[PDB]
Design a protein around this ligand. Structure first.
Ligand SMILES: [Ca+2]
Ligand SMILES: [Ca+2]
Ligand SMILES: [Ca+2]
Ligand SMILES: [Ca+2]
Ligand SMILES: [Ca+2]
Ligand SMILES: [Ca+2]
Ligand SMILES: [Ca+2]
Ligand SMILES: [Ca+2]
Ligand SMILES: [Ca+2]
Ligand SMILES: [Ca+2]
Ligand code: NI
Ligand code: NI
Ligand code: NI
Ligand code: NI
Ligand code: NI
Lengths: 378, 378, 378, 378, 378
């Protein structure tokens, strides 16, 4: 079995108005998929987190080390490609592009052995996960307080057990947003907050001290990803558990954060941290200190399918009866190609997402959707 | 003053036979320049280290935050662009692409103020630097021992005060290469060794212990860039000063290495570490412990010109009469567009390279060479 | 371009009654400016923090290394002069005197290139800053509680968004002062406290625990500048963010404090820490852990102008929309030559200070004021 | 008993040609004495290390806190004056000026109680010390190798048991100088080396490794005083014991160096580190780890007299029969006012200097010499 | 001047009923004085903390190194005697016995120079100190709660500004005692607690958490003196400042505790820690981190006189107007020879104790009291 072709597929949809987090303002949904074809006809699919056209370019640069290789040998291919572009690599785009490749190769490997990826990863502890809803972005002329209060009441009505709202813009308004969301969702629904690294350490500590009374399960990216000493200060300075990981990369970046005691919850993204091959190594590292893994999930149904395979296989830390299980980050904001790339959608039903069990990722790509939402040439 | 256009120029030349280091095998010289044009006509030039097409793609992704901006405001632009692509950035391609942009903007700023970059950086301590020659690569059916012995005798005859040879392939053959080169160059010429991270820690310690008698001024990239504990072990375990930095990025990556006590010589590349804006911050960090900076230099005359501006401005650590000054890494292997991109070559004369003092980088690009050596479309 | 003369100008005004902080009692305003003249006629101005006549003497001792030098080469001159008097230097007067020289040279450099210092520092993120008012000093037979309550209500009426009061004399009376000031300024105006290192660690922790309910944004110089372990204890032992820096010096002194985790806010003074050349290096160091910089500002309009240039150029940490920006420390106590040294005053208008954008510091010295307020010969 | 006057006396002698170390080039001997007079007629004398006119200015700034004070209360006066100028003080000139004041006050205190300072410090362990000779400086057109070889043979012939030569200029020439001096002085005379912080860490380690075979008792100021991590690297990287201290200040600066494990020998200067009051505290600190104190001595007979009082009182670490005793640094280069300031010279006789036992410093100043060598007005 | 005789004087008074702390039960007051006589007739007096007959035996063992020595040379004698018995010494009785000797020698030295010890120590910052009263011991059939409530109301009525009560027996009863004492003394009198190392770490943390609401200025010897990690846990685990030092010894024992961050207040005893010679070194060490010194005082008027001399000389940390000053521990329990050993008592008058200013300790021993209260032969 040999890889014969490696392709990328850029997807875009323009929004009605731009969406803003504290870390970014964007006016379109833009994603990239990786397609790897084999000499026996087998095709695998993956997705890369982050800047879409630059990821496509890095996948193309890796392609020379993929063509002619046996796609079943995922550890060998991962290490060879990791080393090939390591010099001006190590974090960021060199790992997000390798993650998409890795996911496509594990899809091929599952198809070849007739096994779901979750089985090849070592087994299925669970057949479904509870999802949590993520919030809307800041938009021009939209009041964040009432928009988030209504939107999260709407998520509660759909059956989500938890939701996560975007802050990081300014302590006082962010507190008004948190208070209004708690009022709107009632006392039982779980609530998380994500600052998108918008805060200074002092802001993040002040916000956490003042928000903790609203019952907040974690505080995601309080500060920038490079200042691990700042993460540890926020963790020690206010009471809300701190989460991060969607902007860290590989076993070395993740170990740097765990060594620093940066987080209570580590949040590797399948399509960013290095793929299935590397996320299993990151999950090992998290067991040394007992730090919970909850994946970060952002992107199309291909990303969702990959994250679901890993979530079926995640081993509890600790094992006990009815252990703490992963929950699935579910973006509810507008993206017509999120599900359209799949022949069958991977959707929350009363807040719960069932994990496929077919070979590989357990999905079938809709190639007509790739054409329909193709990103226009520059 | 406003930026109106940002372009990249990909350059390629195929070699007669592939060149191999321990870290890579390549069959062509492939580089990318950045061109930034302003509303008043001013044009600046820069270069990005590393994978050429992926760098071009990341420069294109940054371009949206550059158009319409005042190019004189280099710290503002650097921080804005750094944050824009930080999430799946931080090291590697997101910093090598920003370095090329930064260099072009400092070229514009010098042209605008009528000042060499070295002057804007704070002054010229020196008007020239001594260069050292780098060695040939491993080639199919070429004996490394005799090839390096002859090649380095040829560099000595050209007047280079020092040379650096490539090892990392295997302790015993590498020792034969070092011994033959010392014999060939005589007792006075300085000698350095670069393993291109080819060694285990045990190999690197064994090689350094056994090579130290040949008089070796530093041992570059003994081990992989992510294992800073391995660098510190090599530093403590054998007597040759350890050098690294061409595969680290930004103030945070460089501080991580200095904190770890990884190196005796830190080797930021102008076109990789973040450009002039960030290399000044890295040079600050190196003064906290007294670690010598010697830039890494690889690429075309644009990279050479940038590195020379920084070398004129480097402050001695410590200041004394006849202090330890930077020496210029000078690749002598075949590349017809290395100098052709410049209207006037920046060449060693009896081992010494004179540093331009005209506005900006002090060079004039030869646009006809950009066409002649343009990389063929995929 | 060559420096031809270096002069100092001592200024004094006797007060109606002495002013006391916990760290000092003084009966006059006494300051020193530095004037550097060039062979082409260009003149630059600077100011030194601290003992005026001793600063003038240290500037005179540096003058021998300045005459005949190119003033545009600020990094070279800084490093040469720093090394010249380092042996019995390193902190204190050797750095405050060099700061005044450095500021005058950056004023010359901006005039020469036709650029504001803020532009040469890398760009203007902002054109104005909000000022905060500092409080009155302790005076004989004046009740601190009512004096501070009235004075800070008067600052609120002038439009200052925040104010900082002097404590450090004794926990119980200091708490009465803080309580009365909070009552007088209302619930929205921000409040900071400065102990001028008057407290033991135990006093400072007790004061912070008992004062935190009044809403205090930082606690400045709780303890003496040499006991960095005491700073870290105060930071960990009570809830008010700790600030310091006006009594630390250079990259090495500031790094010592940051390494120790001494402060939540670092407060370099342009005229004390080493000038523009060194404060940019200190600002780099603060980004490693994410410690906020808020400059310390004390002295004449020349100091104010220098601090404003640096504040226009300060890069947010982190970058976000509407980031945390520097605020300007504005002494409101009596000093007739504070503004008189400038042809145009740099004053708060409804609490906001606009940052000049002319070449260099963007000011014009009033030489007649230098004569009018000249310090009498000993 | 009350202080009534505090005066300084600046002394200068121009040399025939300038003298150069790696850290400085000077063309005159320039020193400052402190004279403190009391209401009962008692006068005390001291000396300040470092820049003479700036020290005089700082002594004048302290004078306001001295007049009217009881000079017998040396700990109270030290702490009051230390705090008075601490803010822009802490190291350097604020401590060298306080050292001269402190020495004059201990001279007064000894005269008042009819006791040598050595007795008031706690007793005389010894009545004499062996001196070591320091070497000549680098001079224009003088070969350092032969000049040092002849000069040190001349010191050997005068009976000095040891000598210390100046290096720091460049590893190869410095090694030639060390080798020639060892040849010239024979195998028994002790040899020390002082780099005046001229070296990078790499140079200092290389020099120490290559020089150790010549039998070197210590290696003084290998690197700059602010890089304590560099001192520890030099200490660990080559075999010659490392010495420093003449460019550190006070208990906090000295503790910083000892904490860092910077030195095998700590070298406080009576006229730089804080005087008798502070050097006793530094000597305490050195006993925590067992680091030997050997004072640094540079200046006139007043400095020599102060250093001799402290050397009589230094407690062995450890106490044993025939313990390791301090040796006296004795500058032999030309200075006609070194001894002329005293009515009776304090000179080495066959290498040994006898320690006065009269009240205070045990000397009588020659006021006619103060006039003869008075520094010309600026 | 030479020492001719060294004598000890054992004192005893049997109590009506035994007194118990958590650390000890005793039925008599038992103390030892040291008397040192000189060839010129001068006599000095000192006291040793701890077991009286064993201290007398250790003083006798030191006597051989004292006879014939010059008593003015206190640092030489201290170091010689310290080394003489160091091998089976270092802490405990070898230092408490040396402390008594040291005090007698400083008494001789002050008489010889006609100076109070406080002056020889460097000056008098204060002429009096405020005393605090210590509480009664536990006694058979006496209710601790009502006994302490009444006794401390009686101390308040005598004018003491503060008092310290004995706990360490059991958390619940100890809390009842603290509550009753706070009720009895009113809201202003200061309150301290001393567990005499009776508690486990868990008890001490629980007690401090539950007692802090009663307004407690320090918590003395919460745990045993050898478990410095336990001290640091108590300090970090409950809010009352922790004090210790009366059971530590010398610069090395005290530095061990300060290094460990064991205490907020260090409490050397003049008659235990090494005397005046060593307590000055301990006071130096406490300034490195800013830990307050408050001496421990237990014993006769000779101990009281020594402690008062040191308290006059203690330098504020930090210096400020109206700084934090030492307060004097004043045992009020029955001991007829406490004051009888002095010709003039050293007593609190409205809570304040005036510090003698005569030569030496400033006291005159009543030799008739030494006979009257002589301890009966075994
Ligand atoms: Ca997120
Ligand atoms: Ca908190
Ligand atoms: Ca290399
Ligand atoms: Ca070895
Ligand atoms: Ca302040
Ligand atoms: Ca607290
Ligand atoms: Ca020296
Ligand atoms: Ca070595
Ligand atoms: Ca006690
Ligand atoms: Ca507690
Ligand atoms: Ni749509
Ligand atoms: Ni060719
Ligand atoms: Ni006035
Ligand atoms: Ni002469
Ligand atoms: Ni009785």
């Amino acid at each position: 079995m040999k890889i014969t072709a490696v392709r990328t597929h850029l997807l875009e949809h323009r929004l009605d108005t731009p969406f803003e987090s504290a870390s970014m303002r964007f006016d379109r949904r833009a994603h990239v998929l990786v397609e790897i074809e084999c000499d026996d006809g087998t095709v695998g699919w993956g997705e890369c987190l982050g800047p879409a056209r630059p990821n496509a370019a890095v996948v193309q640069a890796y392609s020379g080390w993929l063509i002619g290789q046996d796609p079943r040998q995922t550890e060998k291919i991962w290490a060879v490609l990791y080393n090939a572009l390591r010099d001006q690599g190590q974090r960021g785009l060199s790992l997000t592009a390798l993650s998409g490749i890795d996911i496509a190769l594990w899809d091929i490997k599952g198809k070849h052995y007739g096994a779901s990826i979750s089985m090849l990863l070592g087994g299925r502890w669970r057949e479904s996960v509870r999802a949590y809803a993520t919030g809307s972005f800041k938009r021009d002329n939209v009041d964040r307080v009432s928009d988030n209060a209504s939107e999260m009441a709407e998520r509660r009505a759909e059956g989500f057990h938890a939701c996560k709202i975007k802050i990081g813009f300014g302590v006082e308004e962010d507190l008004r947003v948190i208070a209004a969301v708690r009022e709107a969702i009632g006392p039982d629904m779980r609530l998380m907050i994500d600052a998108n690294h918008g805060y200074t350490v002092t802001e993040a500590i002040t916000l956490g001290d003042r928000a903790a009374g609203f019952g907040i399960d974690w505080f995601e990216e309080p500060v920038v990803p490079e200042q691990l000493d700042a993460y540890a200060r926020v963790r020690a300075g206010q009471p809300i558990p701190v989460a991060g990981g969607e902007t860290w990369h590989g076993r070395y970046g993740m170990w740097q954060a765990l060594s620093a005691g940066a987080v209570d919850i580590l949040q590797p993204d399948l399509c960013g941290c290095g793929g299935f091959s590397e996320i299993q190594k990151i999950a090992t590292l998290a067991t040394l200190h007992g730090v919970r893994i909850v994946p970060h999930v952002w992107g199309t149904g291909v990303q969702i399918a990959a994250a679901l395979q890993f979530m079926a296989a995640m081993t509890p830390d600790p094992v006990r009866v009815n252990p703490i299980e992963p929950i699935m980050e579910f973006d509810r904001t507008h993206n017509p190609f999120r599900q359209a790339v799949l022949r069958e959608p991977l959707e929350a039903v009363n807040g719960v997402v069932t994990i496929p069990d077919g070979p590989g990722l357990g999905i079938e790509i809709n190639r007509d959707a790739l054409t329909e939402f193709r990103m226009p040439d520059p």
